[PDB]
Each structure stands twice: as C-alpha cells, then as structure tokens.
Amino acid sequence: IIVNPNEPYLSVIKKVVKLSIPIIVVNLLYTVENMISMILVSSISPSAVAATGFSLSLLWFIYSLMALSYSGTNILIAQFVGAKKDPSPILINGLFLSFLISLPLFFYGKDFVLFLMKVLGASETVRSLAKEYLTPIFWFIPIGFLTNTFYGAYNGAGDTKTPMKVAIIMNLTHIGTAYTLIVEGAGWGIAISEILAFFIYTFLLIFFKPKLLFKMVRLGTPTALERAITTLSFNVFVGFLAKFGDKVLAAHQIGLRIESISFMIGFGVMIASTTLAGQNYGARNYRGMVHAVNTSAHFTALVMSLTGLILILFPHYLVYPFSRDPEVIEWASYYLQIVGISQPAMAYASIYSGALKGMGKTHIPLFVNISSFWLFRIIPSYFLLKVIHSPLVPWGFMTFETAVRALFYYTVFKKVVGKLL
Amino acid sequence: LSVIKKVVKLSIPIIVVNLLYTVENMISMILVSSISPSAVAATGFSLSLLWFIYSLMALSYSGTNILIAQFVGAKKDPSPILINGLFLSFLISLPLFFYGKDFVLFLMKVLGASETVRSLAKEYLTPIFWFIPIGFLTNTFYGAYNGAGDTKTPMKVAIIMNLTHIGTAYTLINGKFGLPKLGVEGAGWGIAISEILAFFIYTFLLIFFKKLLFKMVRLGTPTALERAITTLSFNVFVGFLAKFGDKVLAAHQIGLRIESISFMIGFGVMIASTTLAGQNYGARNYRGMVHAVNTSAHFTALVMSLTGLILILFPHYLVYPFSRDPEVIEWASYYLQIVGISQPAMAYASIYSGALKGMGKTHIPLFVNISSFWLFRIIPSYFLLPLVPWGFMTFETAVRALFYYTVFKKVVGKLL
Numbered sequence: 001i002i003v004n005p006n007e008p009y010l011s012v013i014k015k016v017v018k019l020s021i022p023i024i025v026v027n028l029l030y031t032v033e034n035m036i037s038m039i040l041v042s043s044i045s046p047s048a049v050a051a052t053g054f055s056l057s058l059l060w061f062i063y064s065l066m067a068l069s070y071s072g073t074n075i076l077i078a079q080f081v082g083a084k085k086d087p088s089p090i091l092i093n094g095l096f097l098s099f100l101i102s103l104p105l106f107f108y109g110k111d112f113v114l115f116l117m118k119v120l121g122a123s124e125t126v127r128s129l130a131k132e133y134l135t136p137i138f139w140f141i142p143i144g145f146l147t148n149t150f151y152g153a154y155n156g157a158g159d160t161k162t163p164m165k166v167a168i169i170m171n172l173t174h175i176g177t178a179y180t181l182i183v184e185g186a187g188w189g190i191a192i193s194e195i196l197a198f199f200i201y202t203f204l205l206i207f208f209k210p211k212l213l214f215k216m217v218r219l220g221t222p223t224a225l226e227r228a229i230t231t232l233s234f235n236v237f238v239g240f241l242a243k244f245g246d247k248v249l250a251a252h253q254i255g256l257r258i259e260s261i262s263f264m265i266g267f268g269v270m271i272a273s274t275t276l277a278g279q280n281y282g283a284r285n286y287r288g289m290v291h292a293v294n295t296s297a298h299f300t301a302l303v304m305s306l307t308g309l310i311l312i313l314f315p316h317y318l319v320y321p322f323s324r325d326p327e328v329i330e331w332a333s334y335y336l337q338i339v340g341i342s343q344p345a346m347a348y349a350s351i352y353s354g355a356l357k358g359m360g361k362t363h364i365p366l367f368v369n370i371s372s373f374w375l376f377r378i379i380p381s382y383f384l385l386k387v388i389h390s391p392l393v394p395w396g397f398m399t400f401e402t403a404v405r406a407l408f409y410y411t412v413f414k415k416v417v418g419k420l421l
Numbered sequence: 422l423s424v425i426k427k428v429v430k431l432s433i434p435i436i437v438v439n440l441l442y443t444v445e446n447m448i449s450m451i452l453v454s455s456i457s458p459s460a461v462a463a464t465g466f467s468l469s470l471l472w473f474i475y476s477l478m479a480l481s482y483s484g485t486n487i488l489i490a491q492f493v494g495a496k497k498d499p500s501p502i503l504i505n506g507l508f509l510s511f512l513i514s515l516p517l518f519f520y521g522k523d524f525v526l527f528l529m530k531v532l533g534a535s536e537t538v539r540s541l542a543k544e545y546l547t548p549i550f551w552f553i554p555i556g557f558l559t560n561t562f563y564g565a566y567n568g569a570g571d572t573k574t575p576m577k578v579a580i581i582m583n584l585t586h587i588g589t590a591y592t593l594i595n596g597k598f599g600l601p602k603l604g605v606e607g608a609g610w611g612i613a614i615s616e617i618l619a620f621f622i623y624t625f626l627l628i629f630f631k632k633l634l635f636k637m638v639r640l641g642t643p644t645a646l647e648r649a650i651t652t653l654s655f656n657v658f659v660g661f662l663a664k665f666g667d668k669v670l671a672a673h674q675i676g677l678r679i680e681s682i683s684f685m686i687g688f689g690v691m692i693a694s695t696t697l698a699g700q701n702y703g704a705r706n707y708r709g710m711v712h713a714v715n716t717s718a719h720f721t722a723l724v725m726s727l728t729g730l731i732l733i734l735f736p737h738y739l740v741y742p743f744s745r746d747p748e749v750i751e752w753a754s755y756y757l758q759i760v761g762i763s764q765p766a767m768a769y770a771s772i773y774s775g776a777l778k779g780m781g782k783t784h785i786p787l788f789v790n791i792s793s794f795w796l797f798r799i800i801p802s803y804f805l806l807p808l809v810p811w812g813f814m815t816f817e818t819a820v821r822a823l824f825y826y827t828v829f830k831k832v833v834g835k836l837l
Contacts, residue, residue, distance in 0.1 A: 100796070103795075103796070103800065104795060115531075119527070119530075119531050214788065217788055218784055218788070221643075221784065363639065367635060367638065374516070
C-alpha cells in the first residue's frame, strides 16, 4: 500500500516529501561525489582533470543507454505493486535486460570516448590519461547497469530509503577508493563503488523478495533517446555562448552548478511522482493520482518559487564561490536572475513529464522535451537572434521557452486523463 | 483474394523504381569516373554518407505510407494525411538544411579523408542540400502513391527522374551544350534539378488527383532509427572483415552490388506487403491480409529460391564484371554461395517486417533487426572470429529473421 484515495481531501500530502528527500539525498550526493572527484584529480595535474572532465561530460552520453534498464524496471514495478501483482518477473527480466544492452559498451566502450575524444579538441597526452582513467570503468559496466536497475526496482515499490543508505556508503566507498588509490585510481573508485553497492543489493536480495522484454524496451526506448538527444541538444545551446568567448562560457558553467544544486529537489519529486503515478494507475485509482500529482505540483511550485527568489535576490552571493572576474560575475548574475523567474516552471515540467513515465506515457516527454527545445529554445534564440550581440537572448529565451511546455503542455496531462475517465 | 492474384502489380512498379536507381548511381559514378578518380571518392563517400543521412526520410515516408493505406482501406478521406505529411516532410528537411552540410566535413575528417576530397565533397554537396526540401516532398509523394496502391505513377516519375538526372549530369559534367564544366558540381545539379522536375510533376497532377501530426511521428520514429542504426550495424559487420586486408574488403563490396541487383525485388514486395497489410488492416478484413502476406511470402521465397540458387551456381560468372585478382574472385565466390542460401529468408523478412509497419507496430523491426544484428551476428561472429562472419550472417539473417514469423502469427493470433 502507498496510494492515496480518489481525491479524499488531505490537502496536505506529506507522503510526497517522505518519498523525495531520499531521492534528493541521492542526487545531491552525486554532486559531492563529483566535486570531491575534482579535488582528488586536481592533486596531480590539470591535464588529468581535463581527461576526467571531458570524460564525465562524455559519461553523460554513455549512460544515456542506461535508461532502458531503469524506466523498463521502474515503471512496470510501480504499476504492478499498485495492482498488488507479483513484481518478480519484471526484476529478473529487467536485470537480464540491463545485462543485455551492457555488452555493446563493454569491449568497444573506451572507444566511444577515445574515438570521439579527439574529434572535439583533445591532445595526445590528455587522451592517454583518459584511457587509463576509463579502462577499469568499461570493465564493470554490466555491474553498473545492474545497480541502476536495482535503483529503479526499489523506486517502484516506494522504498527509496534503500537506495539512499546505499548511496551514502557507496560514496564513502568511492571517496575512500580514489583518495587512497590516487588517473587510473579514480577509475577504480567508480568500478569498485559499483560492485560494492551491487553486492549490498545482492545481500539485500536474500531477504527482500521472457515475453515482456518488449514492454520494458518499448517503454524506455524514448528515455534512452531523450537522454542521448538532449545531450547533443544542450551542446547546441552551449555552443551559442561559445561564440561569446570564455568569459560567458565560464559564466554559463557557473549557472550550471547553481542550477544543479537547485535541480536535485525537482528530480527527487520527479522520480517520486513517477512512482506515485505508477502505483495509482496500476490500481485503477485515477482520481487519486491526479489529486496527488496536482498536490505535488502545487507544493513543488512553491518550493521552486522560493528557489527562484533566492537566485534572484542573491545573485552575487551564489556566484561568490566562483566569483573571480567581474565580467564573469556580471554574466553569471544576469543568468541567475533570468532563470530565477522560470523555477516554478521546472516544478511542473518535471512532474508532468515524470508522473507520465509511471503512467506509461514515456513517449510524450521525448516528443515534448525535444520539440520544446529545437523549434523553441534553439531556433527562436538563433534564427531571430542573428542581430542581437548579447548572451542574454539565449538566456532570456531559455527562461521564456522553458515556461512553454512546463506550464503550457499542461494539456497532455490535462486531457490524457480526460479520455482516461 | 481467395485463389491467386497479381501481387506483382504493386511490386513490379516499385522494382523498376528501385532498379534504375542502380543505373542512376552506376552511371553517375561513371559520370564522375569521367573526371578525376579523386572525385569518385568524393562521390562514393558522399552517397555512403547520404545513406546515413537519408534516415530522416523514413519518418516522412512511414508516416505517409502507412496511414494512407489504412485509410484507403477504411474508405476514409486520406487527404489530411498527405497535406500534413508533406508539411511535416518540409519541416524534417529543415534540420538538415544549413545544419547537416558541415556534418560531412566533420565526418569526413574523422574517417581519413583528404584535404582535396573534403573540398570536392563540398562542391558536390552544395546543390544537393539546397534542395533537401524538394527531395523530401518527392520522397513523401512516393509513400503517398504507394499507400493508395498506385505505384505506377511514381514509376513514371522515377523514369523521368532518371532521364533528367543523367541528362543534366552528362551535360553539366563537361558542358555539352557550350556550357562550362561544373566538374563534381555538375553531378550535384543532376540530382537537384531531377528532384525539382519530379517535384513539379507531383504538384501538377496534385491539381487533379486530391493536428494529429504527433501520431504520424509515432509511426516513423522506429523506422527512421532502423535505417539509421542498421547502417552503423553493417559498419560493424564490415569492420570484422577489414582485419583481413583489402582483398576481403573488396570482395564484400562486390557482393554488395550483386546483392543490390537481387535486393530491389524484396524491397518492392516489402512496400507491396506494407500497402496490402495497410489497407486490409484499416478495413478490418484480417482474412484478406493474412492470406495475402502468406501468398506474398510464398511467391517471393520461390523467386528468392531461384535468385539465391543462381548466385550459388554462377559465382565467378556474375562477379567477372568486378573480377580482377583470382584471389578476390575466390573470396567473392564464397560470399555469393553463402548469401545465396539465405535469400528465401529475406523474402519472409521484408514481407513480414513491413507488414507489421502496415499494422502500426513499427517498433517491431527496430527491436528485432537491432537485437538480431548485434547479439546474433556481431557477437557470435566476434566470438568465433572470412567465412565465420559470412556464415553467421546467412545463419542469422535466415534463422532468426525466419522463426520471427511467429510474432506475426502472435500479433494476428490475438487479433481474432
């Protein structure tokens, strides 16, 4: 049991924040894992941090195929626990499906970096560090694909406290492994942290609990696309500010870290709403999920309304840890006040697209976050952006555009449930 | 629909369209072999790169070829599918318009091009990309006339597309009419001007012939990724033979042309089965579509049983147009004998994987031909690793593509 009834008042939901703070902790700890990873790699040379830096941002492209092993496992388990049906065939077929697509990026995995590494602007000695840094990682990718599937498996059953306690220890495993082994030492910090957490889940399986490979691949197919395509998409949005020198290039990276710390709240509610909508839609409790997602939307909007306010009223404060060049503090402060207006939009953007994932409409955020980016973030902030001479137009449009969809494709949730009743 | 019928009435016109397309590029390669050999490399690497790029046409094709068939079968007005198909087609032509031109320069330099080849590729791919909207509209008109079952009209246009393409190329290659030699640019204008003249035909007869755009994208999205990912997949399959020198690399491309001369048959029947399965599924008549795809599979497998058998019995006869070194004739003869056995299977593959496109489950060939090329061709070959990846291909492209026919029997099993 986890589902709230069919609009049964309870205007305060409470249960949502209990099943979100754990996901917020897991996502905030992902930043501490990489921030400390930058401190441990910077102890040797900046050439190794370049090999690690471009690899992590490239590990985004790699881990995009990890979406099938998550959504295919997270969604069906959430619905099956909702309908009180045995959620065991989804786990064994999901963990096998995770290992299935784990083979392509097992052998020719370091090539996906090294080959693409030089075509963007790498050196000969920088890439040799990346090869030593990534060789122990691509050996244990089927291990990571199993850990990711275990993550999505617990999220469906409404037990996000298990991937929280494991994340706290897994990071101390990663912190301890690299800090002692430290460019190849940091690579063992990832592989060993993935076999430890996996074996904990293996130990947390002794006392925890194939024609559907289609349904798992079919649901998460847009997710692996949406992840991979948005990466290239954001690369196009960043490229619009590379034309304004490294000054604004650094100022956009400063806004990224300020957004990332401000994003872990929403992504935690997203995976939450993904579970809450799945358990409700699985039990044929349709009036309750809309009463739940609307409640989460209302509360997350106020959380984001506070978040944007802090970004607006303390721009120079939030850039202070990165405040060096005043022209960079300039563009960074302008960015914070611009996207500080579009924070409540992200409350509805992630929930409407996140709750639909559990409901099965995973193909919608793909068609959505792409079409609400190309002919909206890029083209209006490019085609009509020829004569502007300002970085505030891709920033002004990204805030303006993000609103559309976030608040303007409400409709897809407004009406997909309309015919559902 | 109960005895036997001329199912070739849909296949033959498309076969002519899929043929001569061979001649359109064989002669064009000769028209660019008339100049310097460096321009032929700029041509081949362009057409190959055009194979990768021409993956977004499936979204503009399947979205138009599938729904029109179902609606022509359902006797429902199929005009909103064409006006929004061409409209969507024009809008999928913009992401490549002035944004995928430099993609060639970014991709040629990563495969080992020459500073001159990248330049000849530009002068060749300059008029091609200016008229991407015109080629996409004609590509959508193809599936439009195929969906309605009128594949003879594009066959007339394909023949028009040929005489203008070769005519303009052969003229602009050297300036036959007192014109300046455009070089590699003349072949580029041959394609472009042949697209605009074919497009004007489709718009002229549109004068006397004849929203929910999200659903169309839900149809062509897996099909577009199939052509895109299979191209990378076959790149990995060839990569297993690059380790055996250039004599095995050459014999494989020789088999490619001999296969293509034998491939245009099944592709036309695939579109034929794509249309026949489309109309009868939109009209609920399931006994008519199951009996048709069964009869299509039976008749095509026999043709492919003759086609492959000839390849097995006449290897060194059919390769001599490409034979130079007897060691290359050796490896090429084995490739034909191996693929000649799996030819009757591709008959069932193109017809079944293609009928499911007509039924709306277009994410079926994607989930299959990917999971069939990788963990059944690439992986088993990579383990046992030229007759090891060659035998496995036939062993796979037959057996796995075969017994997958049960999924069609299962999709139909619950359909009744």
